[PDB]
Design a protein around this ligand. Structure first.
Ligand SMILES: [Zn+2]
Ligand SMILES: [Zn+2]
Ligand SMILES: [Zn+2]
Ligand SMILES: [Zn+2]
Ligand SMILES: [Zn+2]
Lengths: 253, 253, 253, 253, 253
């Protein structure tokens, strides 16, 4: 595998050195598109491009998307700061597309836990759009000490109940110091044309965050990239799990 | 940003010094209307007036409406006491209207948390009108010590369970010493004319307090100003949030 | 305002000294009607009579009906004992009618909390009639010590869980030593003739006790006097309140 | 008796207005002696002077020496600040001498508790001189909150075990922020010349603080003024008390 | 006063720049004597030298010897590392002598708490020499987490009872990782030649650490520099204190 530290350097290098057939540093381009007036907040990375430049790393984003995606986003921040003189910029998403293999919803199982997968299907439902606290900041009213707690949309809220410093239970979530982003759930299932006779379509529920919410409507057929996550059944007293697709990239077909 | 202390002085100054084209101190006028026989209990402030007099402050009421609104209300109280000889008067609301940008319900997301926004839409529902304890006063039956606890309508009731002074758990809410105001909930959603084809209208729930309750009926189309607030989902074990619009100003169209 | 002690003396004086145009001490009359064979257990007091004799006191029954009503009832008990030689008589209600202003159900809001109001409306529902423990007496089985706890019909049951004297948790409500009275709930709403076009009638729930239960049927149109009371929403974790009208006087129209 | 507030004004007035036979404001003199190069830190007040100027107050210093002494010291501070322009000066002791009645050690009993008495006797013992924390300042290491706790030399150390603010038990006495003064114990007993035949001399233990420590040696015969204080026997489970003389003034004879 | 950071720079500068009449950087010399074969582990600093170079700082070592002494020792470590290429060297003591005023034991009182004083007297007793843990290192046997706790010889042992990290009570003092130094107690009292007639000599107990233990025998007459420290009486329930002299420098006369 590839150490975190090293994974960043290699991403930063891919970002600033990969070129298409005509020689253009395509990802410098995309990074530049973050600075324009109506700017994007993601950099869509074509997996085949990454694989053609550094295949070891390209396979590690599939085996370890959590660390791989995050290293890419740190690289983006570096290139911005160092090549564009831009520290002020916010969170920028590294969104991978065009993976080597495409699953159908019915093919998704336990083998895929915490790996980056690509699914083709049709959107059955979309939820309403709600704020999600991606970074909760809890403040102690007794001593003013702040405790930062990052969150995951598929997991439950990680609270804190004692000030790290003073030990009192007079802690509350501080909304203004906390960081929120838009959240939207959706269901995707197999396309009816790929089903055989009276075979029953399987589905999977997904999560969209930030700039990729509200990109799809029921009926839309899409190709998505995401991390398959698991959470215990609502009982939480069974070793069976519910599966959720944390979306990394999504496009219509 | 603008310090609290300073924010008041500048509001008081705007209130007593801003004049229209003919020279009339319009807001002295409005403040005067609080003293008449059937008096108003708000002062509607035209944001464009404020911006034309003190734009820095006008932008701070949008970025920090909680402190900005409250500073304006303190200013109103000053001008009353100092220019009209009136301390006896109660709570007077500073209600801002005519903000620079107007959202549709569907445009409201996490970017708007705790900021003053302006929404145009059509009222789907209105709740029944109920008392809300804006200032709870809990009294200790064992030593007579009183503890004041201000409240927010969108948050849950902040109780107290131990006398600050004697430490006993013989504390109850004292209704007569507490301060109540009328409360009314309502739902607003996108106007059907702004929807495209078979697009689905999104909605947002809101809270009306005091003198602006019962100003709207289902079917009414309105322009409202308010603070977008968030509260955790009813589970309270998810980092997803429900959004509520605490209304500052409302008018029919 | 008017001190309790003093409020009684002034009520007793009004009761025994107020006379109509022909000179008859009308309230001596009414008090006399308590001693007859099929006796009344209330004394209906005409507010305009009280106001014409002692307006300061007449306004204090509206601002402080809880203490005002109770002082009147103590006055009744005095006049009985002193002018009729009657200590044996029970609880006798002071029931005020004919207040200066009449509200419609829709006019009732937070301004009216714990004040005596007069409402005109039409009875939508009446509940079944049930015993209410107006004075709970809890007895300790370990030492025989008795603890008296008065109750309110709109509030929850104030239990006691430790003998004041011995400290044991072997306390139960003693039914025979406790005092019960009949209870009946009812709903009143605006009369359809006062509504405008397709306007929606608002309602308010009420409580009848003792001799005024079973005085009304659904469909009856009535004028009632009562104290507007508030109790927290069933959740009890919101600062919103449910309103209940504790009836002091009721008559058909 | 004489209210605290008023007691100060009257002391300040005595200090600045009392004059001897030749007209000299003797106590302005003494106050001046606090500003010289080797300055005193007490002002010895002749009780007969005080009595001749304001006898009511002179009797209150005997009945209520704790409040009387302290009011005098506040007066001294006023006169300094207002007549000499001196706020910088420290604690200055008001030390009364020449009381109307002089007891022998054997005459001291329970009648004298918390009253200013004057005793003549001979010093049997003197203890070693030690620091006494007259004002303990405890600091919370978890939130930096400081709690001031004044002390008495005859009582035990009043600790604090929970931060007032954060509630943690991480509180310690801060030596540098606390205020210390020298302390010395001594025993005084009846002079052998006043004893009759083979009568046994009684004794009483005393406390000297600050500038009056080390003023006496065993064998010295002295006249002292002090407050008689009581503390429970070392067992602390008997209602019998040990008596200690908190010295206010001391002189050799 | 003088900030810590700044206090170091000024000490380092004094150490490397102060010169005697002939121009020799005397303290470079002394620092050099730390590197020789039988090396010293203190640098004796002549207070008059320091005062003649930087009097502000020289007075701060007397008012704040704890921080002043420590800043000097950090300066020594800097000059060693930077001018001699020596990081490997251990703890080196900054020991001040020749202060402006010399007390007799009997002059030492509460005014001197936590200040550097100089006393002349005769050694009455010397204790046996024992190890003192100047830096206690407690190790958690459950997770291997180490907690460093510096100690003071006059205070009691600051234990730790819960692993900072894992929270278990399976913590013990680790002798090898902890730092020990030799400790010796001694009593010093007034010299009989300075006593008057039959006056009684007072004494004070002291602590010697590390390289200055075993420097004195009973009967030796000495001049010592030290910090006067206080600790509560053994009862620990009285606000009286025992005084101990933490020795910084000692020499025979
Ligand atoms: Zn804290
Ligand atoms: Zn209390
Ligand atoms: Zn009992
Ligand atoms: Zn604290
Ligand atoms: Zn551990």
């Amino acid at each position: 595998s590839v150490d975190r530290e090293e994974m960043i350097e290699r991403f930063a290098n891919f970002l600033r050195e990969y070129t298409d057939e005509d020689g253009n540093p395509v990802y410098r381009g995309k990074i530049t598109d973050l600075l324009t007036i109506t700017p994007k907040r993601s950099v869509a990375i074509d997996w085949m491009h990454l694989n053609s430049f550094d295949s070891e790393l390209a396979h590690e984003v599939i085996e370890n998307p959590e660390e791989g995606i995050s290293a890419a986003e740190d690289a983006i921040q570096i290139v911005l700061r160092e090549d564009f003189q831009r520290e002020d910029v916010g969170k920028i998403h590294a969104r991978f597309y065009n993976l080597p293999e495409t699953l159908m919803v019915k093919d998704i199982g336990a083998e895929h836990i915490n790996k980056l997968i690509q699914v083709e299907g049709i959107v059955t439902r979309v939820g309403e759009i709600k704020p999600f606290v991606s970074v909760a900041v809890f403040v102690c009213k007794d001593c003013g000490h702040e405790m930062i707690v990052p969150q995951k949309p598929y997991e439950s809220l990680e609270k804190v109940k004692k000030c790290e410093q003073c030990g009192s239970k007079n802690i509350e979530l501080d909304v203004n110091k906390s960081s929120f982003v838009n959240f939207q759930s959706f269901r995707i299932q197999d396309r009816p044309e790929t089903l055989k006779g009276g075979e029953m379509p399987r589905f999977i529920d997904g999560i969209l965050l930030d700039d990729i919410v509200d990109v799809a409507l029921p009926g839309d057929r899409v190709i998505v990239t995401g991390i398959l996550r698991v959470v215990l059944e609502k009982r939480e007293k069974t070793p069976i799990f519910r599966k959720i697709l944390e979306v990394n990239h999504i496009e219509p077909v």
